[PDB]
Amino acid sequence: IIEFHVIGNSLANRRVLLWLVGLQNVFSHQLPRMPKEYIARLVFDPKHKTLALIKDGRVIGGICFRMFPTQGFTEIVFCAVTSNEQVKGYGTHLMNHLKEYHIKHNILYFLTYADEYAIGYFKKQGFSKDIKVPKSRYLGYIKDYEGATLMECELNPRIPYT
Amino acid sequence: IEFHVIGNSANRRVLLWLVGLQNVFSHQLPRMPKEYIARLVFDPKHKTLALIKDGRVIGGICFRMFPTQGFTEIVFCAVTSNEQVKGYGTHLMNHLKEYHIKHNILYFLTYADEYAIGYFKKQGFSKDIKVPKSRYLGYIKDYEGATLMECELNPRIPYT
Amino acid sequence: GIIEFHVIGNSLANRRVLLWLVGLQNVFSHQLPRMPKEYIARLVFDPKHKTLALIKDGRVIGGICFRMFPTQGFTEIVFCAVTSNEQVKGYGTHLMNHLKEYHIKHNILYFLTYADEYAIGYFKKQGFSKDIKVPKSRYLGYIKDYEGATLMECELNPRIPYT
Amino acid sequence: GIIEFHVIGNSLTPNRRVLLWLVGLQNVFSHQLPRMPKEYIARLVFDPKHKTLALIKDGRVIGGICFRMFPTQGFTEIVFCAVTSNEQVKGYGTHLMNHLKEYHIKHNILYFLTYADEYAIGYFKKQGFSKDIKVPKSRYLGYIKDYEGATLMECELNPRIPYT
Amino acid sequence: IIEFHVIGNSANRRVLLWLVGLQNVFSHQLPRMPKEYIARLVFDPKHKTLALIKDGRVIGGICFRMFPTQGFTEIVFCAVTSNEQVKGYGTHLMNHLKEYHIKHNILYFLTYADEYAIGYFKKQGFSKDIKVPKSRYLGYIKDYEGATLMECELNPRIPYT
Amino acid sequence: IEFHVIGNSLANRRVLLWLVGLQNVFSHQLPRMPKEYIARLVFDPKHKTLALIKDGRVIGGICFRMFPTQGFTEIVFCAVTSNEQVKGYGTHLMNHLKEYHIKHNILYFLTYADEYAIGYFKKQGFSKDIKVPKSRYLGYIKDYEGATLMECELNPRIPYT
Amino acid sequence: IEFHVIGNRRVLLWLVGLQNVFSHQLPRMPKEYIARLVFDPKHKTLALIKDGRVIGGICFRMFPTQGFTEIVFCAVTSNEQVKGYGTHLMNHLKEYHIKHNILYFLTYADEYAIGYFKKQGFSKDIKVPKSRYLGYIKDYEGATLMECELNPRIPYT
Amino acid sequence: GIIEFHVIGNSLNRRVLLWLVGLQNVFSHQLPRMPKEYIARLVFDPKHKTLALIKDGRVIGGICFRMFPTQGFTEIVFCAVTSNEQVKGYGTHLMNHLKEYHIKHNILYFLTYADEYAIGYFKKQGFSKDIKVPKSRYLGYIKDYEGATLMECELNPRIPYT
Amino acid sequence: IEFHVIGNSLNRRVLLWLVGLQNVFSHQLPRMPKEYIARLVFDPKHKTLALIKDGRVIGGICFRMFPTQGFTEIVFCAVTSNEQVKGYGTHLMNHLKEYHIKHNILYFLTYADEYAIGYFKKQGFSKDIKVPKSRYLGYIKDYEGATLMECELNPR
Amino acid sequence: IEFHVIGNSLANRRVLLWLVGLQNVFSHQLPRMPKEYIARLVFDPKHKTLALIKDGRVIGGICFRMFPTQGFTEIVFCAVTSNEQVKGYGTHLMNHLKEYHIKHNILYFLTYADEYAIGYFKKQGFSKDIKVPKSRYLGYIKDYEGATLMECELNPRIPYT
């Protein structure tokens, strides 16, 4: 009983608002030292969207991303599956569903700044430390931080990810 | 500080306050399922007295007025962990009492954990329920293992 | 096959929600086949009554017909039926569970019902009891009394997900 | 007979002669390019941010150039480029490219980029494209679909001469 | 997954791309018909198509034109992509089509079957004996050279689906 | 040259003057039908005419009456001015007419032909063997005794232009 | 001491006070230019209000689609300087930009002021691409273009 | 040498706002011992207007006044020419344009309480210490600043002042 | 003499001024296809500072503002022959520059043919290219044989 | 090759650039008439211009001023670009102009012709003997000291195009 939803704050629906509170809960827990207030402002920012992993009407994971169709890439912001539902293949389905969502919107590059604790998941999902995008195109849009590893994924719009 | 009676219908400042409240309630009552605390805090018939410190939620009381029945359900009470023992729990309850006096609601009802019984007893609540069982049963949510407490309000004396 | 649950009520325009309703009228009146069919029709098509319809591939298979009393704090379960074509498949339970979550989201935590002899087993199965907590002064005159039958009650728990 | 050139494309709202021309173009591009998924060719021809210069004979589509304009960056990407088999070697490809050149001059876009497969390079060479890219990498990377076999080619347009 | 959707024009573009998928499939499996002819009919407003969708992708369909005034429906294009043939999808398709037509009070299918499609329509209940009067289908359904006129009568009391 | 399907709608200074021209050439290539009769049909809201116009002048046309409910179209008047004859204008007029009708799902023409029109209709693909049943056209098309009914069936998959 | 982001009577007077404080504490530039920027409805000013009177402010222009803000004017009026209001002003501006999710500050600043911008965390090493601010911010011989990167992982107030 | 006379004021448009600020800057510089907030509150009072002296789109002088049409007189509050455009006859023309404006608005009396430093300019412009307006007509509407000298100017509608 | 920053937006006083400008640019640059000169002068995002004696056009500068890249393209500059050698060309460039200080910009780039060298030099244009090719490429219209010339601004 | 009667009425993308082109053509084949004058007339509302559009370019035109109240039309400017002359364009322009005026019942053209235009106007049927009374054109057509007044009378049955 698993479905994938691309949601976000428009300002209507309550289930969305509760989903976004669930996503904020999930992200905020897995990522403690980041202020709860800050994760909420990002999840509830309209320019951010979340691909939510739903089981039985219930949020168990998702990816918070920020599209920059002006620049040709999407920033991967938050990326988490709740601890009870891990190691079930959900993190890959989440990423693949985000990749097909993005080729159908003519965006073919993901960019993210990753902890040391996330690098492995992004590596598994096909992300690389060789950034083909020039720095003059993402810097200032994606949140750069000292000590973070910029990683890139190139999407082949000719293969169906889902 | 700032005291606000907020709720759900728009406005994003308020809505981010609700999420703050939900995280505080969910944190201080790990007892309760996160999704349940969210469902109530965002219920329109529920509203919350938010304790704000510099645009930031540090406490609150989620309550549901039943004006037709003549009482209010105290649902959630929390002051954030790093801000307690400053008198905020008492100031929040009092603001709530004066809010209800101005709406002719002079009875609070709450189901309290024994972790919370001490707080409600010192805010004036009692285990001896004057409101008839026929007026509240099936209106307030019964959490078994908790004990029902009631507070009667004096509309003539001032609280803030 | 594809199976769906929707609470189909009635206001004041849709095509098949009505045809779902007459089907519901039929399955209730087919499995409850001694109460006057017109009565079942008037209730099923009453505006303040709703019906949780269990539908698969368009055909109606089951339903629970209920009338919420949110001022009084309870809902009346008037009709419960799965068509004999699809019994013994746990659909009676899936129906009641979807009814339970629907009412939890509407802050109604008590069901009340009058059960005939051939439905008491179903309600015991689903958590109902003969020990009534809702006071008489709050249900009497509201729920259709039908007293050759048993008043049973189910208290819901808002914390748990039923579906 | 009655050779026409029309810059067509999908909108968010709305015409039907255009829709059938878009299906024809999707049929020509797909047939001429059979290992690429038909659904991807359809998704591009029907994307609103993509336009196609349809080559029309007797109202039937016999060729086209599918392109996407990037006015913010100052170039256009040539996506698909085809002429029907039984109408080739009739000089229609050159006429198609020239109307596209004229169309892009009028819109202040004076650079064409394209990732050519090996079977298209000869056509692009004869139409004035080069492997020497004057547009900076910092400008097209990520906007145009790169591919690890294709050959990036560029065409510079003269806005003062008339290409038609 | 498998979905059945009756689509056409009025449209959308999940629908338009589905129609292009349908047109592509009809054209590959019927190299008999010109590609622009198939596109014209698949995109004609008075035509509808029962689209067989798998993974959000078109794999089969039955394009038909309803003649409610004349009391029958014309089966125009009928195809399942090669990878999914011999899976019983052609019969599920026709079944859902018969159900769709029972609920619109159309109980007679007419079709012209080429040499290669006659067997299939036999398996789905069609016959070469046409009880619809020639005065009511001639000029309405399109004749195709050398094909065979075949007809199916529907029973409103069977839910085929 | 231009081919324009015009017709009087129940306005456009130019198209009416064209319609007057077609009325003239119809009446002068058929100089004993009451011009009053030609005028009423040319300007009838349900008759339309494929006008063959050159440099803004009417040189030929086909006046017709479509019966979509009945499945056919009536050819009523068919002519090319006496100067512009013997240059293939009557066939190109007939071919644009067929293209128009195939796009409108009308695949049968019916007409009554006089002395001078039989060979023309034979040229353009017409036949004296009538496939369309008498119940479908009698009373809808304007009958003559002495004239010869002729029929044309259109193939919707070839392009006629 | 009250902080207000502004750009009504009380507000207009407050903006004239800001133009007065800026033009006095920065007598280089034309008061006409200073007024133009102060009263642009797209420039904003974090105003430092004491007893209802303007004693300082920071005038800035957010470019939320480009992910930065230009620091135009920074001034505390002279009889309030050594009290450290300049730092509280900058902390309120940083914190305000995190809430509105903008993390790079850009400013052209006098030699007369660079020392202040360093105590506030600015550097002359410019990580931001030129094709980002070009044509949006206004050049001077501001001795240095200077950048400050903001970290949301920390409340700034 | 493009110079312009404009009567501007606050509605109870923005190059009026910028001209007002320049005028407040002018008066504030000339009167360093008045609070600049007070000069602002007056210049931006709607009941106050200012005859702006403009050159090349830039306020170089002005006269801030308040009309009392119910009382039949106007108060000159502020009066200044920026100090490098002085001694060019601009102070005369500023006051003359103000005279023309007021006779076309049926006001024939200027009143002003003058600095020690301003009396000689007013005298040059026809002001007098002999006040014909009765005290019952201005006292309390204008402020009698201790140490100022009340001065008056009687205008003639038959005279063309510009 | 009036200076007007005009252009086509989506008005006839302006319109005949545009045609006038197009003629002056056409006559002084006499073998550039006038369809091209007109196409730009009437392009809605090209603008022209019209130098207007009487109420008629006696000179002008057609330019094309490119903010995100930090420079404006000068396409056309001409004073008609009667009012040449009074320095109107230099007054024009001064009104252009000052209009550009109040507006977004501090750089001028132009492709100058063999006859335009002198004017730009005296306006301060130089043959050294301190704008990297990474930015004027694809926005200014490259001219083959011409010489790219740059003018750095006076700021205020 | 197309013909359009255009002009400022009280434009669009096409017509304005077309009139700028027309003004350039007129100006360069009258290279010492003041261009401000030619532009003011070309863009004057009561002035119209029959434009010769080879494909999208203007290659020729006739600027005329109708005086329907006075029974004639003033030919103002008349020019074919240097490329396309001695290709017969000047005659077809004039003929399209003649038919346009026939359809508006204006059957007299008056024009003042310089040395380089007399021959052309002779070849178009113009005469030096003016049958329009000087009581009727004086003060309506703009005189031209030294130019030759020339007149053309049109036949309303003649089809010129």
PDB file of N, CA and C in Angstrom, chain A residues 95-141:
ATOM      1  N   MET A  95      14.104   7.811  -5.093  1.00  0.00           N
ATOM      2  CA  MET A  95      14.975   8.546  -5.997  1.00  0.00           C
ATOM      3  C   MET A  95      14.581   8.320  -7.449  1.00  0.00           C
ATOM      4  N   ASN A  96      14.266   7.078  -7.813  1.00  0.00           N
ATOM      5  CA  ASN A  96      13.885   6.802  -9.191  1.00  0.00           C
ATOM      6  C   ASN A  96      12.617   7.550  -9.559  1.00  0.00           C
ATOM      7  N   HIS A  97      11.636   7.578  -8.657  1.00  0.00           N
ATOM      8  CA  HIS A  97      10.421   8.334  -8.935  1.00  0.00           C
ATOM      9  C   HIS A  97      10.710   9.816  -9.089  1.00  0.00           C
ATOM     10  N   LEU A  98      11.711  10.327  -8.379  1.00  0.00           N
ATOM     11  CA  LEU A  98      12.082  11.726  -8.538  1.00  0.00           C
ATOM     12  C   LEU A  98      12.805  11.955  -9.852  1.00  0.00           C
ATOM     13  N   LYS A  99      13.521  10.951 -10.336  1.00  0.00           N
ATOM     14  CA  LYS A  99      14.234  11.122 -11.588  1.00  0.00           C
ATOM     15  C   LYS A  99      13.259  11.169 -12.751  1.00  0.00           C
ATOM     16  N   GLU A 100      12.260  10.285 -12.749  1.00  0.00           N
ATOM     17  CA  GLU A 100      11.298  10.317 -13.843  1.00  0.00           C
ATOM     18  C   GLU A 100      10.427  11.558 -13.760  1.00  0.00           C
ATOM     19  N   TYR A 101      10.101  11.998 -12.548  1.00  0.00           N
ATOM     20  CA  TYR A 101       9.385  13.258 -12.417  1.00  0.00           C
ATOM     21  C   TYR A 101      10.157  14.384 -13.083  1.00  0.00           C
ATOM     22  N   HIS A 102      11.480  14.326 -13.020  1.00  0.00           N
ATOM     23  CA  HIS A 102      12.297  15.438 -13.470  1.00  0.00           C
ATOM     24  C   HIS A 102      12.603  15.407 -14.956  1.00  0.00           C
ATOM     25  N   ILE A 103      12.717  14.226 -15.563  1.00  0.00           N
ATOM     26  CA  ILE A 103      12.935  14.213 -17.002  1.00  0.00           C
ATOM     27  C   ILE A 103      11.677  14.665 -17.717  1.00  0.00           C
ATOM     28  N   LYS A 104      10.508  14.349 -17.165  1.00  0.00           N
ATOM     29  CA  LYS A 104       9.272  14.827 -17.755  1.00  0.00           C
ATOM     30  C   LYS A 104       9.091  16.328 -17.585  1.00  0.00           C
ATOM     31  N   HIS A 105       9.971  16.997 -16.837  1.00  0.00           N
ATOM     32  CA  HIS A 105       9.973  18.450 -16.716  1.00  0.00           C
ATOM     33  C   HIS A 105      11.225  19.076 -17.321  1.00  0.00           C
ATOM     34  N   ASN A 106      11.959  18.318 -18.136  1.00  0.00           N
ATOM     35  CA  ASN A 106      13.127  18.818 -18.865  1.00  0.00           C
ATOM     36  C   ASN A 106      14.144  19.447 -17.918  1.00  0.00           C
ATOM     37  N   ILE A 107      14.383  18.748 -16.815  1.00  0.00           N
ATOM     38  CA  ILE A 107      15.489  19.020 -15.911  1.00  0.00           C
ATOM     39  C   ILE A 107      16.276  17.731 -15.797  1.00  0.00           C
ATOM     40  N   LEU A 108      17.571  17.788 -16.096  1.00  0.00           N
ATOM     41  CA  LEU A 108      18.348  16.565 -16.221  1.00  0.00           C
ATOM     42  C   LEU A 108      19.544  16.515 -15.286  1.00  0.00           C
ATOM     43  N   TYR A 109      19.641  17.431 -14.330  1.00  0.00           N
ATOM     44  CA  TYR A 109      20.757  17.463 -13.397  1.00  0.00           C
ATOM     45  C   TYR A 109      20.240  17.608 -11.976  1.00  0.00           C
ATOM     46  N   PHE A 110      20.660  16.709 -11.088  1.00  0.00           N
ATOM     47  CA  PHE A 110      20.486  16.915  -9.658  1.00  0.00           C
ATOM     48  C   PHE A 110      21.789  17.427  -9.069  1.00  0.00           C
ATOM     49  N   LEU A 111      21.680  18.333  -8.102  1.00  0.00           N
ATOM     50  CA  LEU A 111      22.822  18.784  -7.323  1.00  0.00           C
ATOM     51  C   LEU A 111      22.458  18.751  -5.853  1.00  0.00           C
ATOM     52  N   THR A 112      23.411  18.363  -5.021  1.00  0.00           N
ATOM     53  CA  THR A 112      23.139  18.314  -3.600  1.00  0.00           C
ATOM     54  C   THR A 112      24.450  18.523  -2.872  1.00  0.00           C
ATOM     55  N   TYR A 113      24.353  19.085  -1.675  1.00  0.00           N
ATOM     56  CA  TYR A 113      25.446  19.116  -0.716  1.00  0.00           C
ATOM     57  C   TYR A 113      25.142  18.086   0.360  1.00  0.00           C
ATOM     58  N   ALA A 114      26.042  17.118   0.530  1.00  0.00           N
ATOM     59  CA  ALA A 114      25.796  15.952   1.367  1.00  0.00           C
ATOM     60  C   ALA A 114      26.758  15.896   2.547  1.00  0.00           C
ATOM     61  N   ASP A 115      26.245  15.432   3.689  1.00  0.00           N
ATOM     62  CA  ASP A 115      27.073  15.076   4.830  1.00  0.00           C
ATOM     63  C   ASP A 115      28.007  13.943   4.464  1.00  0.00           C
ATOM     64  N   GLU A 116      28.898  13.616   5.393  1.00  0.00           N
ATOM     65  CA  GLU A 116      29.604  12.357   5.263  1.00  0.00           C
ATOM     66  C   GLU A 116      28.668  11.177   5.434  1.00  0.00           C
ATOM     67  N   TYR A 117      27.539  11.386   6.093  1.00  0.00           N
ATOM     68  CA  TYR A 117      26.622  10.302   6.374  1.00  0.00           C
ATOM     69  C   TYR A 117      25.656  10.051   5.237  1.00  0.00           C
ATOM     70  N   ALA A 118      25.577  10.961   4.275  1.00  0.00           N
ATOM     71  CA  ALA A 118      24.685  10.775   3.147  1.00  0.00           C
ATOM     72  C   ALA A 118      25.403  10.358   1.875  1.00  0.00           C
ATOM     73  N   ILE A 119      26.725  10.531   1.816  1.00  0.00           N
ATOM     74  CA  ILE A 119      27.454  10.312   0.571  1.00  0.00           C
ATOM     75  C   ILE A 119      27.182   8.925   0.015  1.00  0.00           C
ATOM     76  N   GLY A 120      27.076   7.928   0.890  1.00  0.00           N
ATOM     77  CA  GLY A 120      26.898   6.568   0.420  1.00  0.00           C
ATOM     78  C   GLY A 120      25.581   6.366  -0.295  1.00  0.00           C
ATOM     79  N   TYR A 121      24.504   6.944   0.243  1.00  0.00           N
ATOM     80  CA  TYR A 121      23.208   6.830  -0.413  1.00  0.00           C
ATOM     81  C   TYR A 121      23.224   7.520  -1.767  1.00  0.00           C
ATOM     82  N   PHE A 122      23.818   8.705  -1.841  1.00  0.00           N
ATOM     83  CA  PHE A 122      23.874   9.390  -3.123  1.00  0.00           C
ATOM     84  C   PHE A 122      24.766   8.650  -4.112  1.00  0.00           C
ATOM     85  N   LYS A 123      25.873   8.077  -3.635  1.00  0.00           N
ATOM     86  CA  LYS A 123      26.693   7.219  -4.484  1.00  0.00           C
ATOM     87  C   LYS A 123      25.883   6.052  -5.031  1.00  0.00           C
ATOM     88  N   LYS A 124      25.146   5.366  -4.160  1.00  0.00           N
ATOM     89  CA  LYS A 124      24.332   4.245  -4.609  1.00  0.00           C
ATOM     90  C   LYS A 124      23.324   4.681  -5.659  1.00  0.00           C
ATOM     91  N   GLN A 125      22.803   5.893  -5.546  1.00  0.00           N
ATOM     92  CA  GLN A 125      21.775   6.333  -6.474  1.00  0.00           C
ATOM     93  C   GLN A 125      22.335   6.930  -7.741  1.00  0.00           C
ATOM     94  N   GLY A 126      23.642   6.868  -7.943  1.00  0.00           N
ATOM     95  CA  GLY A 126      24.224   7.335  -9.178  1.00  0.00           C
ATOM     96  C   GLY A 126      24.780   8.729  -9.141  1.00  0.00           C
ATOM     97  N   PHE A 127      24.975   9.297  -7.965  1.00  0.00           N
ATOM     98  CA  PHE A 127      25.522  10.637  -7.869  1.00  0.00           C
ATOM     99  C   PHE A 127      27.037  10.567  -7.837  1.00  0.00           C
ATOM    100  N   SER A 128      27.678  11.618  -8.336  1.00  0.00           N
ATOM    101  CA  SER A 128      29.121  11.619  -8.514  1.00  0.00           C
ATOM    102  C   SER A 128      29.711  12.927  -8.020  1.00  0.00           C
ATOM    103  N   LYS A 129      30.978  12.881  -7.619  1.00  0.00           N
ATOM    104  CA  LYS A 129      31.678  14.078  -7.172  1.00  0.00           C
ATOM    105  C   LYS A 129      32.245  14.901  -8.315  1.00  0.00           C
ATOM    106  N   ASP A 130      32.073  14.467  -9.558  1.00  0.00           N
ATOM    107  CA  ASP A 130      32.557  15.219 -10.709  1.00  0.00           C
ATOM    108  C   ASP A 130      31.419  16.088 -11.210  1.00  0.00           C
ATOM    109  N   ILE A 131      31.509  17.381 -10.945  1.00  0.00           N
ATOM    110  CA  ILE A 131      30.425  18.303 -11.240  1.00  0.00           C
ATOM    111  C   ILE A 131      30.645  18.844 -12.645  1.00  0.00           C
ATOM    112  N   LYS A 132      29.788  18.432 -13.577  1.00  0.00           N
ATOM    113  CA  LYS A 132      29.833  18.970 -14.926  1.00  0.00           C
ATOM    114  C   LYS A 132      29.273  20.384 -14.996  1.00  0.00           C
ATOM    115  N   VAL A 133      28.254  20.686 -14.197  1.00  0.00           N
ATOM    116  CA  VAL A 133      27.717  22.047 -14.122  1.00  0.00           C
ATOM    117  C   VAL A 133      28.818  22.997 -13.666  1.00  0.00           C
ATOM    118  N   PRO A 134      28.971  24.166 -14.283  1.00  0.00           N
ATOM    119  CA  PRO A 134      29.957  25.140 -13.800  1.00  0.00           C
ATOM    120  C   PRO A 134      29.519  25.747 -12.481  1.00  0.00           C
ATOM    121  N   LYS A 135      30.501  26.223 -11.717  1.00  0.00           N
ATOM    122  CA  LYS A 135      30.183  26.824 -10.429  1.00  0.00           C
ATOM    123  C   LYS A 135      29.380  28.103 -10.595  1.00  0.00           C
ATOM    124  N   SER A 136      29.562  28.804 -11.703  1.00  0.00           N
ATOM    125  CA  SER A 136      28.831  30.045 -11.922  1.00  0.00           C
ATOM    126  C   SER A 136      27.340  29.833 -12.168  1.00  0.00           C
ATOM    127  N   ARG A 137      26.848  28.598 -12.181  1.00  0.00           N
ATOM    128  CA  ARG A 137      25.442  28.345 -12.466  1.00  0.00           C
ATOM    129  C   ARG A 137      24.648  27.869 -11.269  1.00  0.00           C
ATOM    130  N   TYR A 138      25.290  27.258 -10.282  1.00  0.00           N
ATOM    131  CA  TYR A 138      24.592  26.816  -9.089  1.00  0.00           C
ATOM    132  C   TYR A 138      24.951  27.619  -7.854  1.00  0.00           C
ATOM    133  N   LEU A 139      26.170  28.133  -7.772  1.00  0.00           N
ATOM    134  CA  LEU A 139      26.593  28.828  -6.569  1.00  0.00           C
ATOM    135  C   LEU A 139      25.704  30.038  -6.327  1.00  0.00           C
ATOM    136  N   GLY A 140      25.289  30.217  -5.081  1.00  0.00           N
ATOM    137  CA  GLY A 140      24.341  31.245  -4.741  1.00  0.00           C
ATOM    138  C   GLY A 140      22.892  30.814  -4.786  1.00  0.00           C
ATOM    139  N   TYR A 141      22.573  29.734  -5.487  1.00  0.00           N
ATOM    140  CA  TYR A 141      21.230  29.176  -5.456  1.00  0.00           C
ATOM    141  C   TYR A 141      21.145  28.031  -4.460  1.00  0.00           C
TER     142      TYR A 141
END
